[PDB]
Amino acid sequence: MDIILGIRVQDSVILASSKAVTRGISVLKDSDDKTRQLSPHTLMSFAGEAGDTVQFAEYIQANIQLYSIREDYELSPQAVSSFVRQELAKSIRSRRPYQVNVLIGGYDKKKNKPELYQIDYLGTKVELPYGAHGYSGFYTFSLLDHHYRPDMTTEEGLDLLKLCVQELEKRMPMDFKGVIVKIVDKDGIRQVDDF
Amino acid sequence: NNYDGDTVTFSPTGRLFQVEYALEAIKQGSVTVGLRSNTHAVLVALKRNADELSSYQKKIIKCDEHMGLSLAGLAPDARVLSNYLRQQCNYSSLVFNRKLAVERAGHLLCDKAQKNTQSYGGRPYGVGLLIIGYDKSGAHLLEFQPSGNVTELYGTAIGARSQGAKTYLERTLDTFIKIDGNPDELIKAGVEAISQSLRDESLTVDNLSIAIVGKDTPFTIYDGEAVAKYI
Amino acid sequence: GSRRYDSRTTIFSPEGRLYQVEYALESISHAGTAIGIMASDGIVLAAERKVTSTLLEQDTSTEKLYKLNDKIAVAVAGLTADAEILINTARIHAQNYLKTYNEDIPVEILVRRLSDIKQGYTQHGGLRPFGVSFIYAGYDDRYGYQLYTSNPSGNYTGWKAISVGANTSAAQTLLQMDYKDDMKVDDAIELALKTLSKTTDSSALTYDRLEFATIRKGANDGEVYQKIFKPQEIKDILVKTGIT
Amino acid sequence: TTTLAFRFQGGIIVAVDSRATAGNWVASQTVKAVIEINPFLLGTMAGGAADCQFWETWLGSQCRLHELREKERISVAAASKILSNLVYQYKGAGLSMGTMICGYTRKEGPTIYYVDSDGTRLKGDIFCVGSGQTFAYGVLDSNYKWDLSVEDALYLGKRSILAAAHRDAYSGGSVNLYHVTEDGWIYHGNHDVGELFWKVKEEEGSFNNVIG
Amino acid sequence: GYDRALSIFSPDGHIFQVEYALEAVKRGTCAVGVKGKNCVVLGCERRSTLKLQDTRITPSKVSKIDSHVVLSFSGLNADSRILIEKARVEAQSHRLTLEDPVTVEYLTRYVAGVQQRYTQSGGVRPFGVSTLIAGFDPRDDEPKLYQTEPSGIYSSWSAQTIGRNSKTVREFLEKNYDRKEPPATVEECVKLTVRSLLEVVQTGAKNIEITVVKPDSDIVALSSEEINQYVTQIEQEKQE
Amino acid sequence: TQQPIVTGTSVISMKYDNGVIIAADNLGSYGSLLRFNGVERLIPVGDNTVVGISGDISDMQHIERLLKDLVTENAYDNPLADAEEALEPSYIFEYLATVMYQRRSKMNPLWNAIIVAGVQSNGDQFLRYVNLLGVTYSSPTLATGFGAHMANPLLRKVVDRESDIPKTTVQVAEEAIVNAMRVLYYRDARSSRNFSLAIIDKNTGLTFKKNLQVENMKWDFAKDIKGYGTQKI
Amino acid sequence: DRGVSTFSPEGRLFQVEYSLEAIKLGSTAIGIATKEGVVLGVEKRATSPLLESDSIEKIVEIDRHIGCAMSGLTADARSMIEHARTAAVTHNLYYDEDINVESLTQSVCDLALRFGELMSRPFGVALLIAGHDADDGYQLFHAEPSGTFYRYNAKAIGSGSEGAQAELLNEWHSSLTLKEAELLVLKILKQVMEEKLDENNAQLSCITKQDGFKIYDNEKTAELIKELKEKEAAE
Amino acid sequence: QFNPYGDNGGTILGIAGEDFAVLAGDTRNITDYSINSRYEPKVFDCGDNIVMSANGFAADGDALVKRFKNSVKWYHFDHNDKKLSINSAARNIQHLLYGKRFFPYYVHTIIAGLDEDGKGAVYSFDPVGSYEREQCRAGGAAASLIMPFLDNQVNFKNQYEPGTNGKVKKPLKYLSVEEVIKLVRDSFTSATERHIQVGDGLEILIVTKDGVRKEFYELKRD
Numbered sequence A: 001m002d003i004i005l006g007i008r009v010q011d012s013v014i015l016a017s018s019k020a021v022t023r024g025i026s027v028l029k030d031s032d033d034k035t036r037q038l039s040p041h042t043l044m045s046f047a048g049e050a051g052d053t054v055q056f057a058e059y060i061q062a063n064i065q066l067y068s069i070r071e072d073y074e075l076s077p078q079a080v081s082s083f084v085r086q087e088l089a090k091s092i093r094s095r096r097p098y099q100v101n102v103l104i105g106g107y108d109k110k111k112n113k114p115e116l117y118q119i120d121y122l123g124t125k126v127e128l129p130y131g132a133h134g135y136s137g138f139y140t141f142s143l144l145d146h147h148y149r150p151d152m153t154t155e156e157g158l159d160l161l162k163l164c165v166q167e168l169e170k171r172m173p174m175d176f177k178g179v180i181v182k183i184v185d186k187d188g189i190r191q192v193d194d195f
Numbered sequence B: 001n002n003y004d005g006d007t008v009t010f011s012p013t014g015r016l017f018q019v020e021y022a023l024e025a026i027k028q029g030s031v032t033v034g035l036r037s038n039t040h041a042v043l044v045a046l047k048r049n050a051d052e053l054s055s056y057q058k059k060i061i062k063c064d065e066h067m068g069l070s071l072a073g074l075a076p077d078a079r080v081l082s083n084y085l086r087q088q089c090n091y092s093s094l095v096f097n098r099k100l101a102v103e104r105a106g107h108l109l110c111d112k113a114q115k116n117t118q119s120y121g122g123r124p125y126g127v128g129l130l131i132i133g134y135d136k137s138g139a140h141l142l143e144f145q146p147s148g149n150v151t152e153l154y155g156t157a158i159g160a161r162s163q164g165a166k167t168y169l170e171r172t173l174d175t176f177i178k179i180d181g182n183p184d185e186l187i188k189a190g191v192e193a194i195s196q197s198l199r200d201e202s203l204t205v206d207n208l209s210i211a212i213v214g215k216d217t218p219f220t221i222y223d224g225e226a227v228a229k230y231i
Numbered sequence C: 001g002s003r004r005y006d007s008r009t010t011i012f013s014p015e016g017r018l019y020q021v022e023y024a025l026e027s028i029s030h031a032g033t034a035i036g037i038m039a040s041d042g043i044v045l046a047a048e049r050k051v052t053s054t055l056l057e058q059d060t061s062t063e064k065l066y067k068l069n070d071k072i073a074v075a076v077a078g079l080t081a082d083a084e085i086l087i088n089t090a091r092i093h094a095q096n097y098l099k100t101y102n103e104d105i106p107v108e109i110l111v112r113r114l115s116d117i118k119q120g121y122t123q124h125g126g127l128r129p130f131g132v133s134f135i136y137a138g139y140d141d142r143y144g145y146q147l148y149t150s151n152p153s154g155n156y157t158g159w160k161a162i163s164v165g166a167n168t169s170a171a172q173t174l175l176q177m178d179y180k181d182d183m184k185v186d187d188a189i190e191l192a193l194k195t196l197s198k199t200t201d202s203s204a205l206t207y208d209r210l211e212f213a214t215i216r217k218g219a220n221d222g223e224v225y226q227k228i229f230k231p232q233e234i235k236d237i238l239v240k241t242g243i244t
Numbered sequence D: 001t002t003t004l005a006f007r008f009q010g011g012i013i014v015a016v017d018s019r020a021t022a023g024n025w026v027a028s029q030t031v032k033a034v035i036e037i038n039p040f041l042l043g044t045m046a047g048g049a050a051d052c053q054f055w056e057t058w059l060g061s062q063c064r065l066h067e068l069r070e071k072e073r074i075s076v077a078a079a080s081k082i083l084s085n086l087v088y089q090y091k092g093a094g095l096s097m098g099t100m101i102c103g104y105t106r107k108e109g110p111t112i113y114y115v116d117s118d119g120t121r122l123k124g125d126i127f128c129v130g131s132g133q134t135f136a137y138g139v140l141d142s143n144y145k146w147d148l149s150v151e152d153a154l155y156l157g158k159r160s161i162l163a164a165a166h167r168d169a170y171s172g173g174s175v176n177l178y179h180v181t182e183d184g185w186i187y188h189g190n191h192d193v194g195e196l197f198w199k200v201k202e203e204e205g206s207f208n209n210v211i212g
Numbered sequence E: 001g002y003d004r005a006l007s008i009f010s011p012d013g014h015i016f017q018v019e020y021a022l023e024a025v026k027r028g029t030c031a032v033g034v035k036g037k038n039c040v041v042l043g044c045e046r047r048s049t050l051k052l053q054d055t056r057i058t059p060s061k062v063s064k065i066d067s068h069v070v071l072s073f074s075g076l077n078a079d080s081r082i083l084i085e086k087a088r089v090e091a092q093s094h095r096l097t098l099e100d101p102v103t104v105e106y107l108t109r110y111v112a113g114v115q116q117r118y119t120q121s122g123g124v125r126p127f128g129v130s131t132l133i134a135g136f137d138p139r140d141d142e143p144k145l146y147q148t149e150p151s152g153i154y155s156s157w158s159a160q161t162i163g164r165n166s167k168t169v170r171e172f173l174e175k176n177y178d179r180k181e182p183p184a185t186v187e188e189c190v191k192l193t194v195r196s197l198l199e200v201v202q203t204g205a206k207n208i209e210i211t212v213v214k215p216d217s218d219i220v221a222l223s224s225e226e227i228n229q230y231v232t233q234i235e236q237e238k239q240e
Numbered sequence F: 001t002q003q004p005i006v007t008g009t010s011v012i013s014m015k016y017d018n019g020v021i022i023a024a025d026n027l028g029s030y031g032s033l034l035r036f037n038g039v040e041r042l043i044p045v046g047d048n049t050v051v052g053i054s055g056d057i058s059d060m061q062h063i064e065r066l067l068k069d070l071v072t073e074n075a076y077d078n079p080l081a082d083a084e085e086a087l088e089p090s091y092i093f094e095y096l097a098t099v100m101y102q103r104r105s106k107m108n109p110l111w112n113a114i115i116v117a118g119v120q121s122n123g124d125q126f127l128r129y130v131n132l133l134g135v136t137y138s139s140p141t142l143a144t145g146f147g148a149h150m151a152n153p154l155l156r157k158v159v160d161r162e163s164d165i166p167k168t169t170v171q172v173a174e175e176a177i178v179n180a181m182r183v184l185y186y187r188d189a190r191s192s193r194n195f196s197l198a199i200i201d202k203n204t205g206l207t208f209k210k211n212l213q214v215e216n217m218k219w220d221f222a223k224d225i226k227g228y229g230t231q232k233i
Numbered sequence G: 001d002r003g004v005s006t007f008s009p010e011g012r013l014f015q016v017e018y019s020l021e022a023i024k025l026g027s028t029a030i031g032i033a034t035k036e037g038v039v040l041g042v043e044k045r046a047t048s049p050l051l052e053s054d055s056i057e058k059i060v061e062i063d064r065h066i067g068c069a070m071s072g073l074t075a076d077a078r079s080m081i082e083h084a085r086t087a088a089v090t091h092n093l094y095y096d097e098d099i100n101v102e103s104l105t106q107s108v109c110d111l112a113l114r115f116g117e118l119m120s121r122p123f124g125v126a127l128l129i130a131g132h133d134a135d136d137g138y139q140l141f142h143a144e145p146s147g148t149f150y151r152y153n154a155k156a157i158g159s160g161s162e163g164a165q166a167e168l169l170n171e172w173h174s175s176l177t178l179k180e181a182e183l184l185v186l187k188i189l190k191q192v193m194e195e196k197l198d199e200n201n202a203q204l205s206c207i208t209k210q211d212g213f214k215i216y217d218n219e220k221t222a223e224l225i226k227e228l229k230e231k232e233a234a235e
Numbered sequence H: 001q002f003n004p005y006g007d008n009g010g011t012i013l014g015i016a017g018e019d020f021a022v023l024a025g026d027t028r029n030i031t032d033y034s035i036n037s038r039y040e041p042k043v044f045d046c047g048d049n050i051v052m053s054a055n056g057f058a059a060d061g062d063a064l065v066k067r068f069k070n071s072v073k074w075y076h077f078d079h080n081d082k083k084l085s086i087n088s089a090a091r092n093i094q095h096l097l098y099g100k101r102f103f104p105y106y107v108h109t110i111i112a113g114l115d116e117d118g119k120g121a122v123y124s125f126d127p128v129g130s131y132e133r134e135q136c137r138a139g140g141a142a143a144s145l146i147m148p149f150l151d152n153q154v155n156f157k158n159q160y161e162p163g164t165n166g167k168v169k170k171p172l173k174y175l176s177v178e179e180v181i182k183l184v185r186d187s188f189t190s191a192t193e194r195h196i197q198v199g200d201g202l203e204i205l206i207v208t209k210d211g212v213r214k215e216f217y218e219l220k221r222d
């Protein structure tokens, strides 16, 4: 767990997440998918303390899927993000808090708009055009401030994202073994296999 | 009649009918005999079967190296009470490095049965027990009834047709009490005692059940070919 | 012990009915009639107050119609005290949902949970059921305008027009006769009042013996407004339809 | 410890050392670091001996209860997740475990799950765990191919443990080999490092840094 | 807490509360389940004494437990919601721990276990509900149809019906359903299900609900016009 | 988690041919302050057991109450309470040893070191130690605190092993105990001159001696000692 | 009404005696013990022909060395089996060994009387528990809701129990082979069953030291049924 | 702050033969630099031909042995007087130890007896329950002194056949009870010389099919 990025463009939300899983002085895996599909049009990436990350993500996934079956209806990204924030807000004052930071990328079918939410382990929610967790932000934010435009296409967003990964690969101390990129739009969630 | 719905109700004449109905379950149970001398204490039990294809219901249970009982009535209730005795015997050993007195064993059983006769919801125990043992004051024989009443005796018997064996022991009292340092003769007296409660059936090899405890004898149970000597 | 005095409220009859639920429904059938009618552009809630006294304070009174949130209201039929217990629970449940999801609670979800509470009292706990039947009138962005009813059994169903309380048999026949799908709110208002006027056990229907409420999109642009009618407003709407 | 397990054409190889230490004191040279959950599942042991032993035996009981209730063999995924969910409940209490749950089923094929005491659960093709994991990784990575024969794969797993046993002070004793197939696992013997080292040195021509 | 033993044995060896719960099921609207060669169909009666209903929002008779399993019922409607909720929760819990969706047998066994628990627990009455649970196991194309009842017994059926006048429709299915050759297609299976309900229902308008379940989480509910076409077709063939 | 406040120092004891002897001074120290001087730290249980206690005095008084209550409880429904079913030293010890270990296991110990000395019903000598940790051991000689360091060496010269017990008389054994108490008065800064001594014999029973004093002390040589090295005056 | 844990004037628990009447209404189950193994067989009794009979699970595995057959209110047996399986596996975990058949039966029977005003009523199901261990060998137990269990050489429970038990009395001897026992269960089941016995409405099972507990296939049982009919016609 | 643990010293040793097994242990009990007892046994006959010792913190050691003896007692009650096999006892002890994983028994535990084939068996445990069957095991204060000697003399480690160019190892073979006791006595006299916590006395418990025999030997008392 280390690098997770998110970019909201005109018609979609793009999430990029590092593939490396490191423990001690060994990279145990270089093909790890740090994300879970919460619903057909909502995707959550995550990063933080080992074990807590997956345990939290799957717990949220189970709850949202339960809701979908009960109501035969998909919750809006805004509704899901609020539910997630509250769970983390509860967690921070627990005996042992979830040390997990998340990005929630979703497409609202009622509004026909993409939405990106950044939520840290304290339960601090913000809607953003672009977001990051960890040390990644210290490079990407200033880069996106410069190059990002609100009316960009998905292809323009992917090029903008490539620019971020290149900068991280140049200046970051740790080898994070590249990223898995996923796109969320009106047609649902799909993975970019060649990045 | 109107006063037997539960154990918490007294009858107009001051009787507890649920306790009396529990006492009735013992009378239906198979006969078992208890007797002792000064050196040893013996339990003899007539085991009962469902049919020729079935096994014979085990009547005797070991509680410690120096104590154990025989049952008559509801067997599961005997299992609960014997388990409680095992724990109490065991508590006495671990905490005080002390073998539990047979008299205290009786007192503990009395108090456990009593609580079930004064509270709503619960029921009385439906079993009678004959506890034998050898402690610091020699050999002992107790009779437990689920009313709570525990009684120390030289000899006794409980179950169906137990009056026959109880009469015999009342006649033989002076003889068997002085059978000291002779296990086999004390058992013989107990086997002859239980024989006074037999009707149509006789004592066979997988029917009879004997147990003994004494001065230099741990509580041990004899079944099968080990009781063929006494037929 | 105490077994002797237990009524056993949560058991089946030999015919497979829940005694207490059936007897609670019998109780509700003597309560003042309450009608709900759903139109294409709004919902009407009309209810008859139980034999009014002339010295009853009418303007500062609430017996039949209660507000659950800004988008949902209920009409009550049965024990008012029982209804208020359930109403406060429903109000809290709506706020819990808003707090959790930052969205107003969908009508059915609120109805289901309130109905699930009633169900519990019929299956476990050994307590008497709530002697209450509700008519839920509300709006959300999924299904739009909705009418539901729940009863002591905890069973709920959706409706276009429905009555609870007294004379529901006669009232439901009259609603079934004159109701149609392309109906407006103003027409539904007239139907609700006319139905009560004919099914009432009173001599004549007057403003002081009624509670009335509408849920329109009559506010300014794409938003819902709840109107709990004042005494003078009921007096005017009663004259306007030619009942008095 | 040094333990490894890798996926290949012919199933799964599991290889471990047999050393146990209390500081610099070598407590045992004959420890069983592979635990037989059942005839089809293996679990490796690294970290706390008791924690691994106790809970992976417990895991076998849970796996047995599963097939009694469902009349079907438990998946490697489900078995590993029972263990990971258990240790996650004890997170912060001080459990020390680094295990690999290895198995072969019909729906999954050969599967390895790394499960660790801080809650991590990873599916993967190759894993090395223990104080000598880096030494084993070095030999394994440089010689690993998917199209290894069963004979060559068994040797690679053995040779990788030997590499760690040599360099890592807290690894050694002997090598225990396992081959896992759909029909179950097959034990491929205990190999004393004392005799194995000299044998490999001579036959392979490696370990020139050592005087032979 | 309320502790009373409501479900108890009688002298003749019967548990009347469980048997009276079956009477509540007998009162409920008819529900039918028929499984074909590559599908299962769940048919349900809706009583027509209720006009002025809003069918958009009214609770549907067939409920999705997961994307691949469905549950219909006969008996007390309020009681059914509790079983459906528990089943839906267990479905998600199974996916979370086993990393695989429930089998239809497992889900049935769970629901049946819940029903049984309420027949020997203090302070509760049995569920006045019998269920028909149908679907397809993960990565499997064999159709599954199970039935449960208040006592807690469950079993698998080639075809089955529950509710009021269920003995009439069971009589129909027993002679019309061939074990050696089940309904080969979706149309054949739906038709047999509609036919069986037409023995009991009254009119084939807004009284019959049909839900078709196919492999790999393919579930769809038929509309009024779609069902009415089956009703129109069957009646014309009948006049012969 | 505790810290001892008012404390009692060494308890010493040994076996002899027909029984056991046990002794302890009558002081209750409050740190360096020798606060309380009338403290009895030997507590008889029946006529066949004496429990000697060192360490925290508040916890000692608690243990006194437990032993007193134990005697009461044993008499309940017990016709042979003064005969066959009387309390044995082994019973009393095991009870305390159970309590001490339970209390240490709850991280709330009784801050004591205890020696149970007595004679069993069959005449056998009983002497066993238990402390705040629940640690137990038996030996021909037993002592707590400073007594372990200074008394045991002296008492072991008399009874070095099991075979020396029949050869040791009550006169010789008492002499050694009294000598040991003098040495502790010389060398233990939290000790007093006044002490109590108890003898439990299989023939003569329990003999409890109060208000004993250390005597026949050697101090005269002190007058010759001048300065710390060179000083002549 | 009246208390759940009440004694009758004759000295029996009303609810326990009433649960025994429920067991008499249940489908027949038969067990026979031999030196070569123990055989367990049950009547399935499908309520309707549309019901898929293979889903009727009235014979059940507890462990590799212990099997179980049931009769009565079969839904009540689920928690009893769950307990038995847990008890068997738990003992293996604590003691690294198989658990004795008698000890397993005792563990199940401890649940029986844990009812009152714990669960609300006794179990309405009887169990035949068959198994093998190193000490006492092949065993068959009859576990009742009274909390009592008897060991049996042979035993029948259910609606046709008294008629079947009288038949087992004559037919059983100590030198019965496993094959002879299999046929004897089928023979006696066919006698007491309402509908005609075949592979679909009856099920066989056994437990042997070598192969453990096994439920027979419908193909295997069908051949034993055919072998049985031929042998009766042969004299 | 109160420290619930202590070190009572001492050392123990378990060796397994073909048809027998021994479990030895010194009889000295200590705290810091003081001797508490010169004869305080810590090797116990627990019944069913199982001998046991739990060395380290004596209070925890006594509690464990006491609990296991009690476990054996209840095993007979619950399972028709069945004999508790050494392997079943080992697994039971694991659960006793691990039951206090978060407040451990500070002891090294060893048990000895015969397996179900009649062959000698020794099992050793760490403080929290990890166990292993072995031919040979020393535990306690002087385990580091004794154990490598056992590796050399019992399992013949580092010993090669003379003249074979260090190619043929010395063959493994079972030792007689006489040869084993010689190694035990020499192990303890050597440990007594070089470890201050070891001495006073040596008590050996030998286990055969006939039962449990005892042997006692003096050790240096300094």
Ligand SMILES: *[C@@](C)(CO)[C@](*)(O)[C@H](CC(C)C)NC(=O)[C@H](Cc1ccccc1)NC(=O)[C@H](CC(C)C)NC(=O)[C@H](CCc1ccccc1)NC(=O)CN1CCOCC1
Pocket: D001, D002, D019, D020, D021, D022, D027, D028, D031, D032, D033, D045, D046, D047, D048, D049, D050, D052, D096, D130, D131, D170, D171, H055, H056, H104, H106, H107, H108, H126, H127, H128, H130, H140
């Ligand atoms: C390589 C060999 C090194 O990591 C492997 O990782 C092996 C795996 C094998 C053993 C399964 N790991 C160990 O050998 C492991 C190292 C270790 C120890 C402690 C924590 C993490 C890793 N060794 C142990 O666990 C040893 C095994 C013994 C030697 C058989 N055990 C101990 O060190 C024990 C208990 C340690 C402990 C763990 C958790 C809570 C409390 C304690 N300690 C002692 O035996 C110490 N001594 C015993 C005698 O009595 C006084 C205390």
Ligand SMILES: [Mg+2]
Pocket: D164, D165, D166, D167, D168, D169, D170, D171, D172
């Ligand atoms: Mg090394």
Ligand SMILES: [Mg+2]
Pocket: H221, H222
């Ligand atoms: Mg010295």
